Design a protein around this motif. Structure first.
Motif, short mmCIF file in Angstrom:
data_model
loop_
_atom_site.label_atom_id
_atom_site.label_comp_id
_atom_site.label_asym_id
_atom_site.label_seq_id
_atom_site.Cartn_x
_atom_site.Cartn_y
_atom_site.Cartn_z
N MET A 157 2.60 -22.51 29.11
CA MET A 157 3.08 -22.71 27.76
C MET A 157 3.04 -21.37 27.03
O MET A 157 2.36 -20.44 27.45
CB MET A 157 2.24 -23.74 27.01
N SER A 184 20.91 -20.05 28.59
CA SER A 184 20.48 -18.68 28.79
C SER A 184 19.03 -18.53 28.40
O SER A 184 18.55 -19.17 27.46
CB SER A 184 21.33 -17.70 27.98
N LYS A 194 18.19 -15.68 27.29
CA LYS A 194 18.33 -14.54 26.40
C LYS A 194 18.25 -15.08 24.97
O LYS A 194 17.83 -16.21 24.75
CB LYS A 194 19.61 -13.82 26.80
N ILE A 206 5.55 -12.84 30.36
CA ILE A 206 6.08 -13.03 31.70
C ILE A 206 6.50 -14.48 31.83
O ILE A 206 6.06 -15.36 31.09
CB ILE A 206 5.06 -12.62 32.79
N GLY A 207 7.36 -14.72 32.80
CA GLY A 207 8.00 -16.01 32.90
C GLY A 207 9.34 -16.00 32.20
O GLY A 207 9.88 -14.97 31.82
N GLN A 208 9.88 -17.20 32.03
CA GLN A 208 11.22 -17.37 31.52
C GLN A 208 11.26 -18.58 30.60
O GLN A 208 10.50 -19.53 30.77
CB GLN A 208 12.19 -17.53 32.68
N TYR A 209 12.13 -18.53 29.59
CA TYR A 209 12.37 -19.69 28.75
C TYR A 209 13.84 -19.73 28.39
O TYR A 209 14.32 -18.89 27.64
CB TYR A 209 11.52 -19.66 27.50
N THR A 210 14.55 -20.72 28.92
CA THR A 210 15.97 -20.88 28.67
C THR A 210 16.20 -21.94 27.61
O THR A 210 15.50 -22.94 27.55
CB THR A 210 16.72 -21.27 29.93
N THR A 211 17.22 -21.72 26.78
CA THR A 211 17.52 -22.64 25.69
C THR A 211 18.98 -22.47 25.30
O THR A 211 19.66 -21.55 25.74
CB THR A 211 16.61 -22.40 24.49
#
Lengths: 27, 55, 393, 153, 55, 55, 51
Positions: free
Chosen positions: D14, D110, D112, D124-129
């Motif tokens: 999270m 994305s 971004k 670190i990691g990724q969160y797409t929305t």
């Protein structure tokens, strides 16, 4: 608050806490 | 993909008209890029400077 | 710089934290508490400067993350592994040179065939693990914990959608580059040039062309020709979103007769056409931070020494790792100037998601519940249809 | 791989950000009953005065609230959202193209376009929305609003 | 707020076409203000004069 | 009888856009006749050459 | 087009006939009968620029 499919398998019921049945012996 | 014309507007306080167009000044007939250029006035000034450098 | 504030020293003393009471096989079992101050902190109220602060809510922001493809999703039933199709190649007819001897009508002529054998798909798996001990030290109410457990499940069924979306666009950009040999590329020169060149290429779909397809890497279609047209109810064009923005604010705006000539319904696009990566050189895993970076994205099962085959993908920015430079190559267009046009029913996407969820595994000896997700996806490009790339090469 | 791999733990990650308190704001006003009578010719207009000062004591907090809120938006725009989120126009017709391509940027899947790397776990990691286009609203001057409504449209 | 083009018209006897526009000459690509200007020809002539003044 | 604009396009590989129009370069704001002219860049170069010939 | 619908002898090629090598022959056309042949590129150039 939001349910969707809230009561899913064992962990979604494990936070909806389960079965206070056995307590310790004196009181 | 258009143009404009003024025959006015001495290019001191013009704010939001166009970009990459032609703004016909009262004397100079300027051209409006991201900064305003002074094409015909630049031609007249280059002619005057080439006449002055002919000593 | 440091801080001589005593409660900052209390926060800095992480030896009394709860984390030390789970890493070790024994611990303290009683707590004497501590005099908590709020003064000279970021935690003052005016009246009561000795209470620990309060959290009033959390909200669990979640987005649902669609697919943009699943009308392509037809469903096989998980039996067999090899499927294929095939065509017959063309035979131009010949003149009647009657001088030849008459017994050639006894001699035979079998029709010719080009197949394309595909093979198996791939099964995707992921785990997640609800704890009952560490995670409930947060979540001031149980309702937030229930919304937490629901929302992690909803986003772990959204991430599969965004995953297969970006690897579909990966696969057909990779097919656009490493296949589609020489004719059907077209060199544009500007961001407005290929805007004209796309409906140059549209209406080249619909002439009877032995070109524009990819028969010449089939089984028997190495030598020979094969003609196929399209229908315009079937063509799919794709590009960067900046291109279709330039379309939708320039050509259908600043022109005057767009009653029929607007091809914009068949335009799908993306923000950027690469975040994906392809293996070369068949390395192995050696360094600790590499697989630690892999742990940040869910990849748990790989360890040090595990090989990587050359045909794998990695779907996020991973090439900046020191063990992958030179080994790993980004599937991307070269110049941010891209328009790959094809027809639908030339791509084949086919998944199996019937037995998708598995039963949960309860681990009592650390008190967790673990869920798996499995699904069997398959995707390929059938090479027997008309395709045109437009880039700057 | 080995069959005992299934009893390995894969915790979800999270990414958080905390927020402080707000501000309680206060205003007071005092009416008089004795000398106020010396400045009116009826009782009705004095009652109109008493109601007018009250409805202006709510109208002022309205205008205060809205212009401080647009102020904190401009404060955020200048002081937050590091360089990857800001795009650079050149001319005043340039951003007409830029906003039109940007609203079409935001509604794709994305990782971004957000700034979750400023949040706690998001380094670190990724969160797409995505965004829904019933939810995006843009914020400019009224001069640029005029420059839309007279030039392009 | 428009433009024009000729690719002809050597600007000797043109009478009523436009003002503050561009009249593409057969050689010079002139510009028509209240009097006609010769922008590209002015650039070529300024280049030739700057070459001649380089003695 | 029209115009165009780029704010891009450094005029090395442009093929079929327009003729007798204005192609706003990334630096120079060129003009496209049957051959492309470089009006504002020509003004800047004539100014630089007139400055260099002032010895 | 509409060069074709003028009375002209320049647009045929009857000089390649057998008995008609030298001399002229005028003919016209009716717009129910003219078709053009081209490649698709400038067909698309017609379908965006000229229309």
């Amino acid at each position: 608050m939001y349910e969707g499919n809230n009561m899913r398998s064992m962990m979604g019921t494990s936070y909806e806490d389960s079965r206070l049945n056995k307590r310790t012996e004196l009181n | 993909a258009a143009a404009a014309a003024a025959a006015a507007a001495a290019a001191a306080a013009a704010a939001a008209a166009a970009a990459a167009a032609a703004a016909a000044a009262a004397a100079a007939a300027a051209a409006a890029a991201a900064a305003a250029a002074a094409a015909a006035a630049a031609a007249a000034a280059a002619a005057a400077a080439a006449a002055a450098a002919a000593a | 710089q440091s801080t001589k504030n005593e409660t900052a020293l209390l926060v800095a003393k992480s030896a009394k934290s709860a984390l030390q009471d789970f890493n070790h096989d024994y611990s303290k079992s009683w707590t004497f508490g501590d005099k908590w101050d709020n003064s000279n902190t970021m935690f003052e109220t005016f009246v009561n400067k000795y209470l620990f602060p309060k959290i009033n809510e959390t909200l669990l922001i979640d987005i649902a993350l669609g697919n943009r493809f699943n009308w392509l999703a037809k469903e096989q039933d998980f039996i067999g592994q090899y499927s294929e199709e095939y065509v017959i190649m063309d035979t131009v007819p010949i003149n009647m040179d009657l001088s030849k001897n008459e017994e050639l009508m006894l001699k035979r002529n079998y029709p010719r065939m080009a197949t394309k054998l595909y093979g198996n798909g791939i099964v995707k798996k992921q785990k997640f693990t609800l704890n009952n001990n560490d995670t409930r030290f947060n979540f001031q109410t149980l309702a937030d914990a229930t919304n937490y457990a629901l929302g992690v499940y909803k986003k772990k069924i959204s991430d599969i959608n965004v995953l297969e979306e970006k690897e579909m666009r990966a696969m057909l950009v990779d097919y656009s580059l490493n296949q589609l040999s020489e004719t059907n590329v077209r060199k544009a020169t500007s961001k407005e040039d290929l805007a004209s060149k796309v409906f140059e290429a549209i209406l080249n779909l619909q002439n009877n062309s032995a070109k524009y397809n990819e028969v010449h890497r089939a089984s028997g279609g190495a030598i020979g020709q094969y003609t196929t047209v399209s229908k315009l109810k079937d063509i799919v064009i794709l590009t960067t979103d900046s291109l279709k923005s330039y379309l939708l604010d320039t050509k259908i705006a600043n022109t005057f007769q767009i009653a029929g000539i607007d091809f914009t319904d068949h335009v799908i696009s993306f923000d950027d056409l690469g975040g994906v990566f392809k293996v070369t050189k068949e390395f192995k895993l050696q360094n600790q931070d590499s697989i630690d970076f892999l742990r940040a994205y869910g990849d748990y099962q790989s360890q040090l020494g595990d090989t990587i085959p050359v045909g794998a993908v990695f779907t996020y920015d991973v090439s900046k790792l020191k063990e992958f430079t030179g080994n790993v190559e980004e599937i991307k267009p070269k110049s941010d100037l891209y328009a790959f046009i094809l027809d639908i029913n030339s791509i084949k996407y086919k998944r199996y998601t019937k037995g998708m969820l598995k039963p949960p595994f309860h681990n009592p000896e650390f008190d967790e519940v673990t869920h798996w997700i499995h699904y069997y996806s398959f995707k390929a490009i059938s090479p027997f249809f008309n395709k045109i790339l437009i880039t700057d090469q």
